[PDB]
Structure 1
């Protein structure tokens, strides 16, 4: 067992028992306790008592504040250094770089960031030894997906952050039921530290532990490990959220024949009581959570939310593409959320919700840019930097990507099948981003192969810059993007597969004065209606060089007589000639030797159709 007394950590367990853990879970826990040297080990049970007590503890320490206007809601303000851009510090380790990213023809890859095993071991050894001294190591057993779903996967996160424990309780299914379900099965090992052992070597800013200089978020898919150091925030610390959900899961999906994607899942029911599930991939700032929670303007239509951010999808034996939301909550952007843009989110977030980096009103409510509602005379605002703040100051009151973290079970339009273990059958997949010019409101891909190309060719506005963001997965590919494209294409050769219809949307086209041509939000229900009929086989499309678009009079524009359908659906030869050239250069450089034949063929075909305009 040991010749001395430093290997068995049983004496330091303050909740639970090392003896009751599955064998490999114990090894993971105790091995990392030996390395990181926590004071205590707390095996989380996921109970309400655990949660409430931990929140009250963070409140007493000043790590969070209670938002007294609402029911059991809380506010955390971070060190502003811990929400800087850290993609340069997000890496995947594999034996061969080409398995992680394609080797580009001319430039640096924008499709991921590889780190060698050797460089990672050095980075690891310079960070983790002793990193939890004086702190509790929490052990978070969690399921990504409904417990017992054939599509669910289990993780164990070790963390020294109570904020992570509380947020993981919301965003995943956490606690004793998961350990019991796991037994001696496989799981993803998730190791997290804020990187600030006690006694603190550097000043603590805003009661928010982090280590920006050593921040590193690493994924080791061939070891089934996620190892994250130095950040307490978001996808860097809630290791289910992106690390597991997309980066590790996309690699597992490649190995196992399924898909892990940055997609909402919604259910839409028409006035004839027919319901279809749709998935949609848009980048950050492009409105997945607005769509997923849409309040439709068209009478007799209903939208319900399965998930707002991650989809895990697998063709079943019957050929249906079955999707689950592997999350348990919504980790939504707060700024821009209003009664106009997302009324269902406004309803959801007034109880049991943790907010990070938003402003606080003097009566204990929340505030942010784009909230689009006034404060009673008297009510004052504290910014996310803990300073008094007034409407006409230059600095925003909330961080621009500040977040709410809310239980999915509270959404008033949560779908009745949102945690069905079998998943929901996807009939359409939608791509899109911000395109101020050139790209119509909606078009439909001509085939599966064309649809994969449409995903691959996605671009979005960041002077303005238009960047590529294929499949809305640019930050998140777990492996070589060319091999991901081949994996998508391979779905067409699968037995019985019912390949969903693929569409591309653009909510963001602008006129010459910079005004949005389309009102969007709940009005996007009109576009969903057209997609719905297309899936049913309706003769509602006209062929163009980029795909099918709605026929004249096919789109329901009742209540929107002022919309300029001609500018909104216009397709210019000049624009599209440039577009195809841009996509060609991008795919050649960035995908290079790993570009599938079928994607190059779709590029050639689009070029040719544009040439005949």
Structure 2
């Protein structure tokens, strides 16, 4: 782009560029970079090229500065340990800015919205000016050009993330497609503007914990959809700092999707092939910490079935001209929870994460490997553990060796079951959509919606045990992620039924988490969930394998393959109690009335009425 006009030499940052050229950038990309460099005052500007030489130089830089350690047991794997105040995506510090609040959340009838957190433009201006001026002093501003989706896909969109964290650059190279080829594809096109700072200008005003810069008291993750901007300050972690993932590919993208006729969803995508050589793609929305990654990478127990992974967390979907709902994974890697990952629960993740992977907040073994609760693989006599708090650790310490939200960040092209169409620009045709969460009582293993409207209500009605327990509402697994008013999002989903030629997927709801009276899981889950997927497959083919109930279709007796599982308390796992469901519909009704209020579509109110009526006839 061109040099800004100057009476002095205070606006052109060319002398501080240590990789790339401001003159090579598209005009509007130059203006974004240089305007924010003026505000944030970085010492240098590094324009990322996405090369393997860059990446290795970056990793070396962080290793020299003690920001990450090499895991010498594996091939090109690394470990970062954070400040314990900065360990997760933080919804209480996450906002969306629009002129009118109702564009962002429905105005609730009686209570405070739980469907988003609106901030006015003027309050955001104050917050921005209290944070960003001078915030990169003494640091490098990295410029990360990235594509969400295969480079060129009709469904793909480009962002530019400015950050002062080399951890963010390395993680974005895995999680997105990053570098010079993205700038060449973008040209003078539109892009999402992503600004990120850890909020710790040098010299440091406050103590640095574990070599991990953050500013918990000023953390703020903001989204300005009308300006196509995402501005995040004070956290270096996950969905707060890797701005392509939740901030772009769910919050900004769900609003662009509403504007443009598509969907952006917190869904895995998988391909499943049966023993008769037929393959189908499924999408599934479960809340965080409710097993999407385990399902997306399943190793099925049933012989002759195969599952392949297209993505594990975000889906972008659009009807094509033929009426098929086509989906892409806009991500380029998996940002998976590490604890609980074992050969029993996710053997294909175990395979994937031993090369080219960055781990955050797991334990390190003395021979340079990784450990966490639930890994279920013993260490040789002699090998010791350093916990994620950087302290010698043993099991008699009561605290976990890994933080419960610790992650791996691994390339998708390495997974041994990555689907052969996972980067197809046309996307994959979705034939079923699965909702679900953690329900210890009342909700059976699987049911099928009665109609598309009923299915949209079942997404709306989702609830899940918080991870005393509380049963939270998390409609469509999107509660922390709606880019705009949920009522309008329901209308958008309902409207897909009115598109001529639309081939609507079947909608299901699952529950892996039902417990008996003693608190034991009724269903063994994991790869045995292949039995539930086989039933859903047959359903999509029209098999006569369902029985009607008040909450939807369930498997007929004998319809699930439970060979090898004769031991299961089938009475309890599939049972439907009038008393539980009368209470459930009352909670659903109270939630939708308060939280969606004047923006609740008629058709969702009608499905609530019909479910109440069907339960009343039990």
* Shared fold, TM over 0.5: yes
**For 1:322-401, what aligned pairs fall within 5 Å after superposition?**
322-401=326-405
SS in 2 for 1:82: coil
Q: Secondary structure at the match of 2:592?
A: helix
CA displacement at 1:285 relative to structure 2: 1.3
Residues 90 and 240 in structure 2, CA contact (< 8 A), matched pair in contact too: no
Which is worse superposed, 373-382 or 423-432?
373-382
Helix, strand or coil: the match of 2:583?
helix
User: 2:359 and 2:220 mapped to 1: Cα distance?
Assistant: 24
**Partners of 2:294 and 2:89 in 1: how far apart?**
24
1:83 alignment partner, SS class: coil
* Alpha-carbon shift at residue 392 of structure 1 (Å): 2.5
1:86 Cα deviation (Å)? 2.4
Alignment of 1:219-234 (within 5 A): 219-234=223-238
CA displacement, residues 39-63 of structure 1 (integer Å, 9 cap, x when unaligned):
1111000000000010011001100
Equivalence for 1:87: 91
Among 448, 453, 456, the residue aligned to 2:457: 453
| Distance across 2 between alignment mates of 1:543 and 1:265 | 28
Cα displacement string for residues 373-413 of structure 1 (whole angstroms, at most 9, x for unaligned residues): 11111011110000111112211111101000000001000
- The residue aligned with 2:179 is 175
Residue 165 of structure 2 corresponds to residue 161 of structure 1 = yes
CA apart distance, 1:464: 1.1
The 3-state SS of whatever aligns with 2:23 is: helix
Q: Deviations over 1:426-475 (max 9, x none)?
A: 00000000000000000000000000000000000011110000000000
Structure 1 residues 605 and 423, CA gap change in structure 2 (3 angstroms): same
On the 8 A contact 2:585/2:611 being kept in 1, the answer is yes
Distance in 1, Cα, partners of 2:170 & 2:593 = 45
In structure 2, distance between residues paired with 1:357 and 1:245 = 24
Q: CA deviation at 1:245?
A: 1.1
Secondary structure in 2 matching 1:137: strand
Q: Following the alignment from structure 1 to structure 2, what is the Cα–Cα distance between the partners of residues 279 and 323?
A: 9
Structure 1's 323 and 85: CA in aligned 2 closer, same or farther, altered over 3 A?
A: closer
Whole-angstrom distance in 2 between the partners of 1:217 and 1:28: 19
**Given the superposition, is the C-alpha separation of residues 17 and 85 from structure 1 closer, same or farther in structure 2, using an over 3 Å criterion?**
closer
Could you report, residue by residue, the CA deviation over 1:292-322 in whole angstroms, capped at 9, with x for unpaired residues? 0000000000000000000000000000000
2 CA distance for matches of 1:287 and 1:601? 31
Question: Could you list the per-position Cα deviations for residues 107-147 of structure 1 after superposition, in whole angstroms to 9, with x for gaps in the alignment?
Answer: 11111000000000000011101111111100000000001
TM norm structure 1: 1.00
Aligned-pair distance for 1:85? 6.5
Contact 2:351 2:416 in 1 (8 A): yes
Structure 2 CA distance for aligned equivalents of residues 99 and 61 of structure 1: 44
Q: Deviations over 1:261-284 (max 9, x none)?
A: 000000000001100000000001
Given the alignment, which residue of 547, 564, 587 partners 2:552? 547
Is residue 2:298 matched to residue 1:294? Answer: yes
Of residues 510, 521, 528, the one that matches 1:523 is 528
Deviations 1:172-228 (A, max 9, x none): 000000000000101000000001111111111110000111100000000000000
Deviates more, 1:539-548 or 1:383-392: 383-392
Q: Could you list the per-position Cα deviations for residues 476-529 of structure 1 after superposition, in whole angstroms to 9, with x for gaps in the alignment?
A: 000000000000001000121000000000000001111111000000000000
Task: Flag the 1:85–1:304 CA change in 2: closer, same or farther, 3 A.
Answer: closer
Number of residue-to-residue matches in the alignment:
613
SS at match of 2:611: helix
Q: Is the 8 A contact 2:68 2:81 kept in 1?
A: yes
| RMSD, aligned α-carbons | 0.6
CA distance in 1 between partners of 2:351 and 2:200 (Å): 37
Distance in 2 separating the partners of 1:513 and 1:583: 27
What per-residue deviation string (whole Å, max 9, x for no partner) do you get for residues 514-573 of structure 1?
A: 111100000000000000000001110000000000011100111111012111100000
**8 Å contact kept, 2:88–2:238:** no
In the alignment, the residues of structure 2 paired with residue 325 and residue 229 of structure 1 have an alpha-carbon distance, to the nearest angstrom, of 27
Q: Determine which of 523, 527, 538 is the counterpart of 1:533.
A: 538
**Alpha-carbon distance change, 244 to 181 in structure 1, aligned in 2, over 3 angstroms:** same
**Does the 8 A contact of 2:89 with 2:237 survive in 1?**
no
Moved more, 601-610 or 84-93: 84-93
In the alignment, the residues of structure 2 paired with residue 342 and residue 607 of structure 1 have an alpha-carbon distance, to the nearest angstrom, of: 39
* Counterpart Cα distance in 2 of 1:195 and 1:461: 34
Residues 141-184 of structure 1: CA deviation (Å, up to 9, x unaligned): 00000011000000000000000000000000000000000001
Quick check: 2:18–2:44 contact (8 Å CA) kept in 1? Answer: yes
* 2:479 is the counterpart of 1:474: yes
Give the match's secondary structure for 1:20.
coil
Matches of 1:338 and 1:244 in 2, distance apart? 31
SS at match of 2:212: coil
Residue aligned with 1:197, SS = coil
What is the deviation of 1:241? 1.4
Q: Is the 8 A contact 2:89 2:240 kept in 1?
A: no
Instruction: List alignment gaps of at least 5 residues for structure 2.
Output: none
Q: Deviation of residue 28 (structure 1)?
A: 0.4
Q: 1:555 to 1:416 in 2, by over 3 A?
A: same
Distance in 2, Cα, partners of 1:389 & 1:245: 38
Distance 1:320 1:153 in 2: 21
Structure 1 stretch 366-375 or stretch 542-551: which is displaced more? 366-375
How far residue 84 of structure 1 moved from its aligned partner, in angstroms, is 5.8
Counterparts in 2 of 1:58 and 1:85: CA distance versus 1, 3 Å? closer
Which of 578, 583, 597 is the aligned partner of 1:573?
578
TM-score scaled by length of structure 2: 0.99
Q: Is the 8 A contact 2:333 2:411 kept in 1?
A: yes
Conserved in 1, the CA contact under 8 Å of 2:89 and 2:238?
no
Does residue 445 of structure 2 align to residue 441 of structure 1? yes
Query: Residues of 1 paired with 2:391 and 2:191: CA distance?
Result: 44
State whether residues 89 and 239 of structure 2, in contact with CA within 8 Å, keep that contact through their aligned partners in structure 1.
no
Give a deviation string over 1:46-105, Cα, whole Å, max 9, x none.
000000010011001100000011110000000011126721110000000000001111
Q: 1:158/1:54 Cα in 2 relative to 1: closer, same or farther (>3 Å)?
A: same
Structure 1 unmatched runs, 5+? none
Partner of 1:600: 605
Q: How far apart, in 2, do the equivalents of 1:176 and 1:84 lie?
A: 30
- Distance, in Å, in 1 between the alignment partners of 2:273 and 2:592 is 38
